[PDB]
């Protein structure tokens, strides 16, 4: 039914936990073109950015259903990041690319 909430946030947390449990470094691939995205555009290229969300690279991390939020340092300068789930394209480990490209969601289209 079209009324069910999107699965993406749940898959994101699942892969995040799985990657960390395999001692890998989870990274998010984000579409900075979508409404609501708040990232240091200086680090974005061709409408995309890759963010390291492993514990040592972020602070105050929240993997909520509506958005991913955290603080991180870009070139030494601490910045607040906020990304709607619709803009999170995939999650992969830096070391070997293990992870997934999320399935499209009617709720995000």
């Amino acid at each position: 039914l079209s009324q069910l909430t999107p699965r993406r946030p749940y898959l994101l947390r699942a892969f995040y936990e799985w990657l960390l449990d395999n001692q890998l470094t989870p990274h998010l691939v984000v579409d900075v073109t979508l409404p609501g995205v708040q990232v240091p555009m200086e680090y974005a290229r061709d409408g995309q950015i890759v963010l390291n969300i492993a514990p040592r690279a972020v602070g105050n991390l929240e993997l909520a259903n509506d958005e991913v939020r955290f603080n991180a340092r870009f070139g030494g300068i601490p910045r607040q990041v906020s990304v709607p789930l619709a803009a999170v394209l995939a999650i992969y480990a830096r070391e070997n690319g293990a992870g997934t490209m999320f399935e499209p969601e009617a709720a995000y289209d």
Partner: peptide, 18 residues
């Protein structure tokens, strides 16, 4: 640690998938 710069993440294994 610091967030990856563009020249850095573009060299990561998974960027080819994107």
């Amino acid at each position: 640690e610091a967030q990856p710069a563009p020249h850095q993440w573009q060299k990561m294994p998974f960027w080819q998938k994107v």
